[PDB]
Ligand binder design. Sequence first.
Ligand SMILES: Cc1cn([C@H]2C[C@H](O)[C@@H](COP(=O)(O)OP(=O)(O)OP(=O)(O)O)O2)c(=O)[nH]c1=O
Ligand SMILES: Nc1nc2c(ncn2[C@H]2C[C@H](O)[C@@H](COP(=O)(O)OP(=O)(O)O)O2)c(=O)[nH]1
Ligand SMILES: Nc1nc2c(ncn2[C@H]2C[C@H](O)[C@@H](COP(=O)(O)OP(=O)(O)O)O2)c(=O)[nH]1
Ligand SMILES: [Mg+2]
Ligand SMILES: [Mg+2]
Ligand SMILES: [Mn+2]
Ligand SMILES: [Mn+2]
Ligand SMILES: [Mn+2]
Ligand SMILES: [Mn+2]
Lengths: 289, 289, 683, 683
Amino acid sequence: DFTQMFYNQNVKQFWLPEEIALNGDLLTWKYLGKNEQDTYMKVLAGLTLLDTEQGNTGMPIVAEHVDGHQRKAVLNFMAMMENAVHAKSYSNIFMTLAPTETINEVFEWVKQNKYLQKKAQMIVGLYKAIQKDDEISLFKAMVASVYLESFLFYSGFYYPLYFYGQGKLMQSGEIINLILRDEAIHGVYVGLLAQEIYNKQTEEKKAELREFAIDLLNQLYENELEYTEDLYDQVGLSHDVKKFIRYNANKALMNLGFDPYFEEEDINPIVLNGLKATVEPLKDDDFYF
Amino acid sequence: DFTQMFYNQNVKQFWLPEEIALNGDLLTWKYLGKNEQDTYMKVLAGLTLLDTEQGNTGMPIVAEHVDGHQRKAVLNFMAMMENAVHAKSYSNIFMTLAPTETINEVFEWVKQNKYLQKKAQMIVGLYKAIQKDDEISLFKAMVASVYLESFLFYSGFYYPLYFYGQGKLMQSGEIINLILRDEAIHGVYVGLLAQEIYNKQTEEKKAELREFAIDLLNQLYENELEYTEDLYDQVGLSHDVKKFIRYNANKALMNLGFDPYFEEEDINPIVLNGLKATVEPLKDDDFYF
Amino acid sequence: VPKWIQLNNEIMIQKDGKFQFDKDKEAVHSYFVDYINQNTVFFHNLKEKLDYLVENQYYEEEFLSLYSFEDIKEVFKTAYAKKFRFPSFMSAFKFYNDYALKTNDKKKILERYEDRISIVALFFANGDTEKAKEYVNLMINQEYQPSTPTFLNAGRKRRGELVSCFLLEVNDSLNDISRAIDISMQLSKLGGGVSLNLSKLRAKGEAIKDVENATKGVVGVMKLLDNAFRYADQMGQRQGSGAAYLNIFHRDINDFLDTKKISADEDVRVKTLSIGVVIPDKFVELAREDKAAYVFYPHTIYKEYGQHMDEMDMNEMYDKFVDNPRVKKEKINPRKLLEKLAMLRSESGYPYIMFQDNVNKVHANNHISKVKFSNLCSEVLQASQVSSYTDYDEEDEIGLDISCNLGSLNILNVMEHKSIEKTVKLATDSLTHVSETTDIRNAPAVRRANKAMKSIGLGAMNLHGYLAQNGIAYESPEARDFANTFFMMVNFYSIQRSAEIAKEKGETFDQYEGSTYATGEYFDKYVSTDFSPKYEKIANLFEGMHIPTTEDWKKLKAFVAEHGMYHSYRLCIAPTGSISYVQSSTASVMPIMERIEERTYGNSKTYYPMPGLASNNWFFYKEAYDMDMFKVVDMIATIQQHIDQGISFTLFLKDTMTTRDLNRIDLYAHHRGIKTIYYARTK
Amino acid sequence: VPKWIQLNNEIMIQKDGKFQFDKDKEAVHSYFVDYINQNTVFFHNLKEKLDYLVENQYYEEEFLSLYSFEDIKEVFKTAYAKKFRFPSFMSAFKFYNDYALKTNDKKKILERYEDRISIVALFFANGDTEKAKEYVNLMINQEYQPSTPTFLNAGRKRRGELVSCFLLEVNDSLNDISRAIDISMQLSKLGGGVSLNLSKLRAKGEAIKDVENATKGVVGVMKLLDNAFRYADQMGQRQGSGAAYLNIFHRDINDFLDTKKISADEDVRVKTLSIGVVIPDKFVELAREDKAAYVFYPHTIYKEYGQHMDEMDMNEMYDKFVDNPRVKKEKINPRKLLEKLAMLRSESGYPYIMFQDNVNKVHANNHISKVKFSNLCSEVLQASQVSSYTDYDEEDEIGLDISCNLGSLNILNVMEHKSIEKTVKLATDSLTHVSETTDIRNAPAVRRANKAMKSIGLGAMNLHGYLAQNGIAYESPEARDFANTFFMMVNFYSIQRSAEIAKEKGETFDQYEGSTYATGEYFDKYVSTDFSPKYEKIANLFEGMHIPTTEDWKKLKAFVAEHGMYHSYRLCIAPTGSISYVQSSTASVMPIMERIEERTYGNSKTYYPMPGLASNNWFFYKEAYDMDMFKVVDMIATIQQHIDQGISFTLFLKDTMTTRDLNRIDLYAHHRGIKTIYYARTK
Ligand SMILES: Cc1cn([C@H]2C[C@H](O)[C@@H](COP(=O)(O)OP(=O)(O)OP(=O)(O)O)O2)c(=O)[nH]c1=O
Ligand SMILES: Nc1nc2c(ncn2[C@H]2C[C@H](O)[C@@H](COP(=O)(O)OP(=O)(O)O)O2)c(=O)[nH]1
Ligand SMILES: Nc1nc2c(ncn2[C@H]2C[C@H](O)[C@@H](COP(=O)(O)OP(=O)(O)O)O2)c(=O)[nH]1
Ligand SMILES: [Mg+2]
Ligand SMILES: [Mg+2]
Ligand SMILES: [Mn+2]
Ligand SMILES: [Mn+2]
Ligand SMILES: [Mn+2]
Ligand SMILES: [Mn+2]
């Protein structure tokens, strides 16, 4: 009921890194404090590292196990955006803002970081556990994918959106907004594929899959809180970032056809500013009664 | 030495079938004989099948086994083109020119056609035989992919090109030329990756790999002859198409770094004829004259 | 999570194999005691409250000055003497969220249910204390519910119009089209839904003063009206809603229908403009015999005959149109058009179907005009005359544009009080007052027709609730027997009250003398047929209540002949969307869609069982989708024979039913005398 | 292939290293003797031709009845005595495809060039035979060219209006917005281009009768107007063209500009509506100082001060608005807004830029009103007073909506004939007659302002053609010297003719006594500064033609003070799009875009060399893209000082120049006194 519509929306959102000139960001970058520059670098590396997993494994593995030519095509398109567009865009932002040696060090740090690794490996673990012709394991991986696309990225997206909403780092913020817009539709689409599997299950199996999804969400959420304090306490933003994580967790759940887990909260206004039944002919005698 | 330039070429060649309006072909299509329309539909259906498998299976699986994020980005982009752009374009052509029943019938015809099933069996079999960290199985699949890109498509491409060259079906022909332009660069790129693996081998191993490549080519060739006769005898063109596929077989071999295998012949000359403003901030001195 | 929200959510928690229906009384009690009594502004005396409301621009001093404060105090005493309690949480929630007067910052509550009812009654009575007390008793007993505009806005300084349904005729001219856009925006600004007749507009590819093939047709006007309604969005509060009606014999009928397709182009699709199709009996006859039909270019017909195509009887004039070489037409397949209509209704619920000859064969004012189209809710069926809006310097020729005042009897409360006559007459008086006090300064035809026709719409609701709470199935013949008797009584007493008002004021409606009321042709079926119940169970429902007989109808006919009739139109059954919750009633005469209504307000989900739902009457509350649509058609046609205007008839369809099934339902509705079909709702 | 277009394509075949320019003479000769004379209806005598045209609704009988047929015959002899020959194929092709009268089936040709000119002259003269002969001599010599509406429709029965530029002021009300939509559709139906001022409309998020955040802003009205212009498209042959103007200090300025962005959504973007931005000197000063500017909510200013924001002086009230707490304002960066304007003009050519203080520091009728917006062609700059369209029952307060009749002098032919005075006076008389015979009966303010102001627009064309054919570079100081002298003389003789008309008719334009003509301040630079050519080369161009001195200007000032002026505005330089081909002239006073212009008509490709282009003047015909826009600004500002209205000033930009270069050109135009900037055309 939905793949051709998503095909259309995906291909009409096509874009390339070269379209946004990045050099003018140096005019606001130079005015940020060390903690602001440090947080931005670390957040950016976090997003880059997670998105690489999605391009190399997450999207291609789902495309491999999903049946249907049109679904495979949409999924291929999404994998292309991760590897050919998003990955180049993140690299471009980095090369503009930091010298080569600084980029290498930030990636070394974020690669060793406990909270980034915990979530990255949890997601990758579920992708590696998909078994041929087993729709339960596929569903679990789709849940992981939706959580990455619609939830885990957002502790990171917060900061570029925060600057973007203030008139700072506008070129890289525009790029991030385009990336985020792609991840949103990726999350919704994979969510619909997961609901299709979920709806084929018994009531007991459904309850079991719901417990899986909520348990996974809880593990990721508790690690996100730690990840958040680790990055954002030094710039005083953690309270507001936490509200943004919960709001996006609720969107991820709704993508999977589940109820929101967290109470509704208002979001930081600066970040907000950044953000046919069946045709049958009449065969006569239907006009007579 | 080459991936970056292929990356740039692939992304700059990006297109969608919807860019080309097809209603202009309606009359030249109406005017073709029943035999001509039948061959044309079947030819494009055979192409659709090849691109379906190249997009679903061939390109993603090669991407999985090839090392390097940039090489993977190129291969992922090529995969997307196969199933999200190329395979879909044929349906755009079908939906314009043919009634639903004729479309349904031709897709049923691909499923039961023995030559089309044999060529798919052979090519996809080699893709699915790739073993992780086994460069020889990968080479064999890359040879198969080059043969699909640079040889097997051409029994199909002949007919749209033959019409384009006579000023007939020129909108459909424009789509086909764009597809052909893509496959030419896809065949070169995969050819270069295959040569990388071949060049690592002992002379004895190389001799075996040439045997594999030539045996496979001959087996595919013999099947393609029967396919060509089956499609083209009713339009009187089988001998001409055979010359064309031999020509392109030599190009496939060359893409693999091998000498031409078939003698040169004169190809139908008809088929040969078938082939924002920069934003700069205002200065203070700009306001005084 | 609020305590009342938790209590309301315990209904679905099944205890001992049954829903906890009694939790809704606890839910509403908790809602009141914890939120309403806390957020209700209280004053030491009623005088202080009234002074605060008038001086702070909440009320109108004009209508309150008509009474001494003692009379207003006694009216408020009468309202609070009933000690009215909302039976369900949803009733109180809907009232205090939609109709209760709030502070300018929407923080506190000024009006309780009794205060709102007292103010509405004092506005209705217009200076009469006993009449105001009678209105208070009628509304606090919930026998009569004024429409959402009247109930919400009566006696308010910053109020919209008390009328929300308007029907405009659009003439075939740029001046008239621009005036139609202006009037549509002005009426949508007031908060009213606007229906436009586009049948007079010439089709696409017609000549404009010797320039052939220059007209964009009705779809260009449709786009203009859609943007006009989008702009006039009621001060950004509620989305502007409008309707467009086209005759099925109009040439642009296929383009008219293509505006609602899901695949429609953005230069063709209209979003905020509902569409209704008018179908004469000629089209149904052509489709029945599978003869190829013709759609006509209206301007050619106007040039040939001097009359608009929709102003002429298609049954007699269709052959003359077809045989006239100077009339331009295109062949269509009427059966294919019917199938396209059914497909569109399955996909989107559109268009509304108005059976032109079903309306006009019983229309009492055919001398004034035939009924050519309906309103946005497909129940208003009145004669209209197109206005000739000329150039700016010239004088316009003002016609009649339809606008009627809505009110609903609560069938359950009227039946339990044995007060059909009194409730009907008081509702007629209140609707008459609303009609007289309505003056619209930017729709001259609407104002002229309101002053001349004096048409009102008195509807009914809680039919399914009353039947299910009395152990009667909606599709049962006994239900149709009750509907027949009840609505015959309603029609009798509405005609009697209208004639009494005409006698009191010495005036009838304009062009009454040509109506079937004046000639007595209206009363033929009433002086010839007896409409008493044919079932002992139904006849017991009317115990203690005099059912009008044939002799009573003859006396009423003589009274109407002697004294005339004040209202051209009296009865129309509107959907009654949101006022049904406040009245604890099922919507209109339609059957219930769901037994228990699941809705989400804010971040909390709410549950609304149908009024009177329990274990004993669970299966009498049969859902509309589970029902046989033929029997629902039979019920509505039984009611329709006593309603002078139309009834909002929604089709409730299953997902498994075909296009042929929807077409069969439409054709059986046409066969049974159904005037309009509102919506195709699919489960 | 046609023989004439085959000959016309031999121009590009370079023989001996040169373009074969003489082929166009053979091309037009073949065009005539193979298409035109064959397809021309020829009558035995002129009497039969005139009777045939009058009887079959081709001409108007009223204007032809003021002359005896001997006089009409004499006029036609005068037209044919010249034996005019089109010098190029494009001239004749454009005339016989756009302006020549054709039969009702568009099959044959009824009017030649002489016939059309004679009919236009007899229409202008209004019964005078000698005046008709004078007009015939003026137009057959191609010294003066009536605008496309006048030249196309003069004397035709089934015709549009002779005026195609209309300017409407929209008041901040729904009644006024509806009337603006209606009037826009009425004027687009007549074939005219309509410009609307949207500055008085309150911004998005303003209150509509004490409910806040209710107004949709100017973008909703923009969508309404865009659909109104799409509807009134006149068969779609020439779709409805509208322009919207907004003051840069309006709060909706960013949303107003976002309607032209390529990435704009379908619910915001307008396609048929051009946009212009009115920039007071205050905004340029704020951007120059890099200070923080403020855009304002118009309704707050109107409530606080009782006047609309655009009716007040921003250079004196901006600080008061900022300091006023009851005025709502939004902080913006003026330099960022300027950069956005430059980017939007680079990517789409929009908005039009009006420098309000440049217009009003020399505006002669500031007592009536200040100029607040321009027309669709961005050259009409006249005082307007907004109308107050009230409810239907109430009387409307009719203001002044701008409209002027266009007409162009051919600088080359006027200078060749040494007839600046006679051509200017005769053109003024013809434009006065067109103004007097224009009667718009559906735009009350346009009617009232046409009767009261009596404004005309007398433009010029072939400036670059005349300079290039006289060996003068467009950017050269000699070209600006010639333009200064020529347009000073044109202004002198237009003022003299206006004063003579006022003396003869005994009436001046409404509120003339408050104008600068009456006070004599208008003539200060003319009685103080001599405008005789400063170069001997230019002075020889005016040899044999008297150049008014300071004494002549003093005498004219006394004459105007003692007799008054008939026209409030007289001179405006329009683009003159298609009549430039017929007159074999370069478009307006702007430089040429291409030396040889290549066009495709149907399936035929044809080339148009610039008039008089050869090898001896190839490099004097410098393309507009290759020249410095600063020197073009200097030329237009030199011309603008003698033009009371504006000049349609197109900016010709290369791909290499950035948005900073466009902003620099705009700021230099503002510095040099440029009133309006029309288009940012990029090659
Ligand atoms: C009615 C209406 C008005 N408007 C805007 C457009 C007008 O410029 C502006 C004025 O509307 P008005 O027609 O003047 O409304 P009003 O007179 O009742 O309000 P006020 O007392 O403030 O004058 O409101 C909308 O945006 N949408 C609407 O639906
Ligand atoms: N006191 C009071 N009465 C209110 C208010 N809103 C409605 N009423 C009704 C309740 C009574 O029926 C009626 C008179 O109330 P009152 O003025 O207190 O009267 P009384 O009992 O002192 O004579 O007004 C209100 O806010 N305060
Ligand atoms: N005969 C004729 N003359 C035309 C026509 N259209 C324009 N004219 C012009 C040509 C002459 O200048 C003028 C008089 O032409 P005429 O009526 O033939 O007169 P005459 O040649 O007998 O003096 O009218 C036309 O169709 N026929
Ligand atoms: Mg008309
Ligand atoms: Mg107002
Ligand atoms: Mn990504
Ligand atoms: Mn993604
Ligand atoms: Mn391909
Ligand atoms: Mn390929």
